[PDB]
């Protein structure tokens, strides 16, 4: 019961207005009530509301100009008074007039020496999905979000700075990105920079980080505000000559590479959770960058790397299919021929030249198993645990399979030193998950592998919520069959000789694999025939064929949102490969600078065609 108390308090605000004679006269513009009640009687006008009101706030809140002017005389000091506590802390009456976008009360309040640095630190202003808005803390920031120019111009001209910060360290620039109205707030961003008159030694207001260290450029990259990203790009590109329909631009390439430790754009984009931020990669100075980092310098190191893992798994299976085996030892088949097995796993036999070769490749797998683990030690000692799941889902959700591959290789190394019995079960998981993990490289070789996105997209979700409705209809019917052949001799119809196999036996019928039980020579009981017919027309005609059409629908609701995933995942393949690989190979891309006397920043260039009918309509 957290949000209920907010509503509980909010009705309690009204009742105080309903019972105080001043405040209800403050809610309306009952001038002669306020004429008579104020000057005559001897009452204290410092009556706080339910959430800490004054009389001047209510007149401000219910847009009541002329009542506030009469309040100016009797209240020389209520201008300086803030609101009291726990939701609206410090919200003075200067703020509330700004939210109603004008009253010319700012005229009155700044005539009444109102402070412009009182900070609204209340609960209902912090950035949260509980509140429906976010307006910062300072009264300048209130005027900025409602897009009201002449109030903003007024506030600079009375001594308001433009460099205040919130609890999160956000400037007034950062607030404009988080507004939901995009194009109607882009104009404000140019206006406030015009009042950056003082050339400061520290930074020129555009490089100010927050408490998690973000320039307003990068924060717009995080939130996917494309139109704002497009407009701030304009001040960093630098145009060279133009030649008819050609144009030679020169993008800046400073805060968008992985040069610094800040990582500054691209690790910030792929580690988002929001969907819309992946749209940024289609913009012009970025899409050109990663296409150069992949067509050159990314693809051959990747495919040469994926060839190495392919030679690893082959070396594993060769030292898998040759195992030290012997014939069965002295224990003959003691159950009555329900016990057929014949080999049992040699103890300490190595004395062949053949086993020397097998010893070599077996050590190759073990040394490789250690290498996988030591890479992943600094990974999950820093990036939490569920924080790693936030890294996981997008483009690298295998990343534990290669971990659980390594545990199974270690256990079978531990197993043969102990020389214990059940050594076939760790070899099993270490063999499927080995070959399944090469599907990680389906991003490569061409765009002939985005299946590994879609098969991921469908093994979760679509199969998974279909699996339970399998798992109950099988659970009755299999249990129904174990009763119905309880009487019978299992020498015929060995499908159902006991309950635990009868589930798995029924499971083969649900997917149309086993042939379906029949004997034709012994009359099987008369309740089977009705029941098993009822099984088929649910399972292999209604239930399964539902899954194809349900699969058939979901294939083309993700037509568009499949292809951009693939080009997103290459970026995730790129930067991870850049981060773990040292230099003196595939250098920091783009053209180096300051040899041309241009700056320490590095650059790259793009040509294009204007399609000059746009020039020709430009009348």
């Amino acid at each position: 019961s957290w949000a209920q108390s907010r509503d509980e308090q909010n009705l309690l605000q009204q009742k105080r207005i309903w019972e105080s004679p001043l405040l209800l006269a403050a809610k309306d513009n009952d001038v002669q009530a306020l004429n008579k009640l104020l000057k005559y009687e001897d009452c204290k006008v410092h009556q706080r509301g339910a959430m800490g009101e004054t009389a001047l706030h209510i007149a401000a809140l219910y847009d009541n100009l002329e009542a506030a002017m009469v309040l100016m005389e009797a209240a020389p000091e209520l201008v300086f008074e803030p609101m009291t506590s726990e939701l609206y802390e410090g919200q003075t009456a200067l703020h509330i007039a700004v939210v109603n976008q004008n009253m010319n009360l700012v005229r009155a309040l700044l005539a009444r020496r109102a402070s412009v640095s009182a900070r609204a630190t209340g609960t209902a202003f912090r950035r949260s999905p509980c509140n429906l808005i976010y307006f910062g803390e300072h009264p300048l920031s209130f005027a900025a979000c409602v897009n009201s120019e002449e109030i903003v111009r007024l506030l600079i001209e009375h001594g308001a700075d433009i460099r205040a910060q919130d609890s999160l360290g956000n400037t007034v620039l950062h607030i404009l990105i988080l507004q939901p109205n995009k194009t109607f707030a882009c104009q404000m961003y140019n206006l406030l920079l015009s009042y950056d008159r003082h050339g400061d030694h520290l930074q020129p207001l555009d490089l100010v980080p927050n408490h998690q260290g973000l320039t307003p450029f990068k924060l717009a990259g995080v939130e996917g505000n494309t139109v704002m990203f497009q407009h701030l790009m304009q001040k960093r590109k630098h145009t060279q000559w133009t030649y008819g329909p050609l144009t030679s631009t020169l993008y800046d390439l400073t805060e968008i590479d992985s040069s610094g430790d800040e990582q500054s754009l691209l690790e910030l984009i792929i580690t988002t959770k929001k969907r819309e931020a992946r749209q940024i990669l289609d913009q012009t100075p970025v899409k050109e960058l990663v296409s150069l980092k992949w067509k050159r310098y990314g693809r051959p190191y990747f495919c040469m790397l994926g060839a190495i893992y392919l030679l690893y798994i082959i070396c594993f299976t060769m030292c898998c299919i040759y195992r030290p085996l012997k014939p069965r030892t002295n224990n003959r088949t003691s159950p009555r021929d329900n016990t057929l097995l014949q080999q049992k796993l040699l103890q300490e036999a190595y004395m062949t030249p053949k086993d020397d070769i097998r010893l070599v490749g077996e050590l190759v797998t073990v040394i490789g198993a250690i290498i996988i683990l030591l890479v992943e030690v600094p990974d999950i000692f820093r990036m939490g645990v569920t924080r790693f799941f936030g890294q996981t889902i997008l483009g690298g959700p295998f990343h534990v399979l290669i971990i659980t591959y390594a545990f199974m290789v270690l256990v079978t190394m531990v197993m043969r030193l102990i020389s214990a019995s059940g050594e076939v079960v760790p070899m099993s998981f270490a063999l499927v998950l080995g070959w399944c993990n090469v599907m990680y490289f389906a991003r490569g070789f061409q765009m002939l592998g985005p299946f590994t996105i879609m098969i991921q997209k469908m093994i979760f979700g679509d199969l998974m919520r279909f699996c339970w409705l399998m798992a109950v209809v099988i659970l009755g019917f299999a249990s129904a069959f174990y009763i119905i052949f309880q009487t019978e001799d299992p020498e015929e119809l060995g499908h159902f000789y006991d309950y635990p196999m009868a589930l798995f036996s029924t499971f083969e019928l649900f997917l149309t694999i086993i042939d379906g039980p029949a004997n034709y020579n012994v009359d099987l009981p008369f309740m089977y025939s009705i029941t098993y017919a009822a099984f088929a027309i649910i399972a292999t005609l209604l239930m399964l064929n539902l899954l194809i059409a349900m699969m058939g629908d979901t294939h083309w609701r993700v037509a568009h949102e499949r292809d951009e995933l693939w080009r997103a995942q290459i970026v995730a393949t790129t930067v991870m490969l850049e981060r773990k690989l040292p230099r003196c190979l595939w250098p920091r891309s783009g053209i180096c600078g300051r040899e041309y006397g241009l700056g320490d920043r590095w650059f790259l260039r793009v040509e294009d065609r204007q399609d000059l009918n746009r020039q020709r309509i430009q009348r």
Partner: protein, 148 residues
């Protein structure tokens, strides 16, 4: 014809081709005469030279397409000047003929999806087509864009 747009050439070229009956590239008195009196009326064969010599810039007795184009520059299209419908028509029109066709509008909608039926595309074009050739002008397309 100081400045024009591609569509304005292409549609008027279709007009000039439809108006030129023998495809000689010129317009004579005999040619303009019959098609005008095809439409109900009849000019009394003296207006015809008074039609041509009003507009014949060189006085050669013929109306070539540039003289035809600068005449339509004086009978200029209205103030329907935009920028996005201009861009929207370029993405739609593959070959750039100036007339978005049936199969082209099927093609662009297919890449967006929604599975339009063949009859459903014919219901789109026939209502949008003002003059009735089964093809949408640039002028016809903006009237579906702005309001209904």
């Amino acid at each position: 014809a100081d400045q024009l747009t591609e569509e304005q050439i292409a549609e008027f070229k279709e007009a000039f081709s439809l108006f030129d009956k023998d495809g000689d590239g010129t317009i004579t008195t005999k040619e303009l005469g019959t098609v005008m009196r095809s439409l109900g009326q009849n000019p009394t064969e003296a207006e015809l030279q008074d039609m041509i010599n009003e507009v014949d810039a060189d006085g050669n007795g013929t109306i070539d397409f540039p003289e035809f184009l600068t005449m339509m520059a004086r009978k200029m299209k209205d103030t329907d000047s935009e920028e996005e419908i201009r861009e929207a028509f370029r993405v739609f029109d593959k070959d750039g003929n100036g007339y978005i066709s049936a199969a082209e509008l099927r093609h662009v909608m297919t890449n967006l999806g929604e599975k339009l039926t063949d009859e459903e595309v014919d219901e789109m074009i026939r209502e949008a087509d003002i003059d009735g050739d089964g093809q949408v002008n640039y002028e016809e397309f903006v009237q579906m864009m702005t309001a209904k």
